[PDB]
Design a protein around this nucleic acid. Structure first.
Ligand SMILES: [Mn+2]
Length: 256
DNA sequence: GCTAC
DNA sequence: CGATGGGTAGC
DNA sequence: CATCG
């Protein structure tokens, strides 16, 4: 069984302090896609690049302790693409790709426009320029999985308070429509939603109030799988037994 | 303190 | 609905 | 952005 995990670790150093490293092996996952390294190549320890002997490939931001995605895999990838190819977004390290046969896996950290309206604009541009990339990847004819923090909840069932969050970044009508086009127009499969049509499956909880405690969260972490491979999905779950971040690991198992 | 999620 | 208060990571 | 008026 091919177990792929997606985890926005909100700082890989804090995550490791919280035992995320031990979880990498404990989960017996074959591939682990992390977002928000919040560190640079010099800040990363060997266990943060190649945990448990796994191969590791990372894309760090030009800013310190900010963003950053990475991909670990027990198997040696025959190819690795760092960055999307757009310096504007590559400056922040949000895209990594690794090829394993006809299988490609991407660690993706989509910009959050919650901090400021300007960051919301940067997010929208990231959507416009990234959509074509998802289209090309869909047309490659390969089995592709895009794990990561998409920072967009698609429908009401993807968050607790969908009513009061229709004007907030992450659940804007334009954003929901974008994810919707990725799924139905492009042909990508929201693995979780497909496997569990009625299970909300929150992957993130705000630090404000008692969000995590009351389970008032969003499902903004996705594994967008291509049709062929998407049909091979057997099960999935949101590991909550331990908390290493404000996000939660998204585990999906494929008969592949 | 700062930044940024 | 609109108005009100925010914990964390790492610089 | 959850929680309050
Ligand atoms: Mn975060």
């Amino acid at each position: 069984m091919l177990k792929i995990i997606s985890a926005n670790v909100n700082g890989i150093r804090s995550a490791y302090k919280k035992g995320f490293y031990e979880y990498i092996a404990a989960s017996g996952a074959d591939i682990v896609c992390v977002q928000e390294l919040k560190a640079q190549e010099a800040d990363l320890s060997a266990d943060m690049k190649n945990p448990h002997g796994m191969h590791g490939h990372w894309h760090c931001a030009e800013k310190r302790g900010y963003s950053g995605v990475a991909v670990y895999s027990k198997r040696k990838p025959d190819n690795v693409q760092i960055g999307m190819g757009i310096e504007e977004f590559d400056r922040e390290g949000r895209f990594v790709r690794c090829d394993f046969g006809r299988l490609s896996v991407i660690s993706l950290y989509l910009p959050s426009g919650s901090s400021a309206e300007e960051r919301q604009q940067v997010k929208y541009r990231f959507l416009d320029a990234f959509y074509p990339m998802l289209e090309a990847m869909k047309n490659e004819g390969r089995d592709i999985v895009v794990c990561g923090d998409w920072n967009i909840a698609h429908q009401n069932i993807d968050l607790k308070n969908w009513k009061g969050n229709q004007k907030n970044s992450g659940f804007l009508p334009e954003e929901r429509e974008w994810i919707g086009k990725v799924i139905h127009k492009l042909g990508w499969t929201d693995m979780w939603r497909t496997l569990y049509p009625d299970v909300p499956g929150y992957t993130w909880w705000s630090n404000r109030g008692q969000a995590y405690a009351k389970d008032v969260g969003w499902r903004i972490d996705y594994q967008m799988v291509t049709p062929e491979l998407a049909a091979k999905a057997v099960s999935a779950h949101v590991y909550k037994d331990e908390k290493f971040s404000d996000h939660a690991p998204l585990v999906v198992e494929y008969d592949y």
